[PDB]
Ligand binder design. Structure first.
Ligand SMILES: COc1cc(-c2cncc(-c3ccc(C4CCN(C)CC4)cc3)c2C)cc(OC)c1OC
Ligand SMILES: COc1cc(-c2cncc(-c3ccc(C4CCN(C)CC4)cc3)c2C)cc(OC)c1OC
Ligand SMILES: COc1cc(-c2cncc(-c3ccc(C4CCN(C)CC4)cc3)c2C)cc(OC)c1OC
Ligand SMILES: COc1cc(-c2cncc(-c3ccc(C4CCN(C)CC4)cc3)c2C)cc(OC)c1OC
Lengths: 280, 279
């Protein structure tokens, strides 16, 4: 039999330190091709090792197609393609209503709970370790999927803006898998804040801002972040207008329970999921 | 043109399957791994991320999945003439062919073993089936699925070729030098398999695998341990070899691969040097 490995690279939809993401075509089908830089080659190996250990298949987890190494060395990760792009891009120039806001955040919680839970007979527990709005893609059915398991760990390293206090102050209990779950929940709390801001209530909505936009520069340093999160113990602002909306009022409670300095006190993904199904 | 056509199965076993294929009008080899061997696929892909005339040449490595099923591919150059194990079955050697083969294996292994500033690599599964014969009469080493790097769970490769310290599980698991030493033991056995097939004074031995005479067919780990560790057996040197200067030199080399004390064994580089001195 023939094995069609020909993947046409049609347009570049991302270019960073990680390398490049291309919209590609394989047998008429849209695929996403991440071409890794030498800088980021370790992320190809860790993600490939993860998918070689457990083939994750979930609505809210970016769909794996292939890992390819070709002879210098070329490292490609091939996934399902989501034309609407990242949540980060989508929130820039889209507002939400109650239904579309809750659909996004419950799909993210569902993806994250699925990563975090050990399923027997099954999958190991997985912590993502780089959860942010850029690593969440928007699907046409209004649900989201979590992308980029390049830093993931199965039972410091992530984007500085989203790092939990225990990462920034190096108190993270590195011997405890639960520590990495708790770091994901912190970041989930920030993403929730970024989404809730874009949900309209009483004709009011906040403009898109990244977490801590008002207290750190662009490309905050480790020290910038540690002073805000660890020393001053600052948390993102909850606007007054949220307290006139029952949904944003319940989401405010939820995000604050993801932001405790004490990691053990934070909600679990499974608890967040239960709470989000009782909202509306 | 990334397209690959699978033309015919050249091998089938617990490791999976290997296929002669076409790719850009060139012959290639395509290994599709068994589910059992997924960790080897990943380890080999890591190794190949680190090129040499006597190492199986890498083209590509792929993990593919839809739904619950995964395929693991390794694409390499194709060697028409097959494995050394195959080649030795119904070919005899003269002095020049015999040394060319063993000097090329020693070169490949020296290249694996030596850090370039490429890490140091111990193969851990050296055997005639994991060596391929090139048209120029030289060989290349294949199968880095168990290979270890230096700038992991059980102690196991192919039973018949396992070093005494592997069979009695006294091997220094944390010492990289231990893994090089296991390669030299197995290389000694490959030297013996090859030398048996070199004609001297109108005499040649039939192809036999290491320990053919002293263990049951398809020997167990206990079987190998009994003969290597308890009975202290080594492959027999046919007396006819001692009439030949080359086979006399090779018999001396392979005994310096077979000391029970791993620290006593020659280095790949010393074997390369000695084989370069022999004519
Ligand atoms: C190697 O590389 C790539 C390959 C492919 C690709 C193209 N056609 C067919 C396949 C295929 C899948 C499964 C079987 C068999 C094997 C197991 N048996 C039990 C029955 C089923 C055969 C063939 C693949 C894997 C796509 C790629 O990209 C999307 C590849 O990467 C560039
Ligand atoms: C986070 O990480 C990964 C993401 C993806 C991925 C999958 N679908 C779609 C996209 C995408 C497409 C298009 C835009 C923009 C382009 C400009 N304008 C027209 C709006 C749209 C953004 C994003 C991406 C980036 C693939 C990956 O790997 C192959 C990723 O790495 C795991
Ligand atoms: C990697 O990606 C894609 C691959 C393919 C594809 C192409 N040929 C053959 C296959 C295949 C066939 C059969 C088995 C199984 C059947 C059950 N049992 C008997 C074991 C063997 C597995 C695999 C696939 C999955 C199609 C895709 O999309 C249409 C892919 O997505 C881009
Ligand atoms: C050991 O290891 C790997 C080997 C190879 C490989 C490369 N060239 C040629 C071959 C070959 C061709 C043909 C025969 C013939 C011999 C006589 N006849 C009765 C049976 C068939 C044998 C062997 C192979 C097996 C590829 C691999 O992966 C791509 C290997 O895995 C690392």
């Amino acid at each position: 039999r023939t094995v069609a490995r020909d993947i046409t690279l049609l347009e570049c939809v991302g270019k960073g330190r990680y390398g490049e993401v291309w919209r590609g075509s394989w047998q008429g089908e849209n695929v996403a091709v991440k071409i890794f830089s030498s800088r980021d080659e370790k992320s190809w190996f860790r993600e490939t090792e993860l998918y070689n250990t457990v083939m994750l298949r979930h609505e809210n987890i970016l769909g794996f197609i292939a890992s390819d190494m070709t002879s210098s060395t070329q490292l490609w990760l091939i996934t399902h393609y989501h034309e609407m792009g990242s949540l980060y891009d989508y929130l820039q120039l889209t507002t939400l209503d109650t239904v579309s806001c809750l659909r996004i955040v419950l799909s993210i919680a569902s993806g994250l709970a699925h990563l975090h839970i050990e399923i027997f007979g099954g999958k190991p527990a997985i912590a993502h370790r780089d959860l942010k709005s850029k690593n969440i893609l928007v699907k046409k059915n209004g649900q989201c999927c979590i992308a980029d398991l390049g830093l993931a760990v199965m039972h410091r390293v992530g984007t500085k803006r989203y790092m939990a206090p225990e990462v920034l102050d190096e108190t993270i209990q590195v011997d405890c898998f639960d520590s990495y779950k708790r770091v994901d929940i912190w970041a989930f709390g920030l993403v929730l804040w970024e989404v809730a801001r874009r949900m309209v209530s009483n004709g009011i909505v906040e403009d898109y801002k990244p977490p801590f936009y008002d207290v750190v520069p662009n490309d905050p340093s480790f020290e910038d972040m540690r002073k805000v999160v660890c020393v001053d113990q600052q948390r993102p602002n909850i606007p007054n207008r949220w307290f006139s909306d029952p949904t944003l009022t319940s989401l405010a409670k939820l995000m604050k329970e993801c932001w405790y300095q004490n990691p053990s006190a934070r909600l679990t993904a499974l608890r967040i999921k239960k709470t989000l199904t009782k909202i509306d």
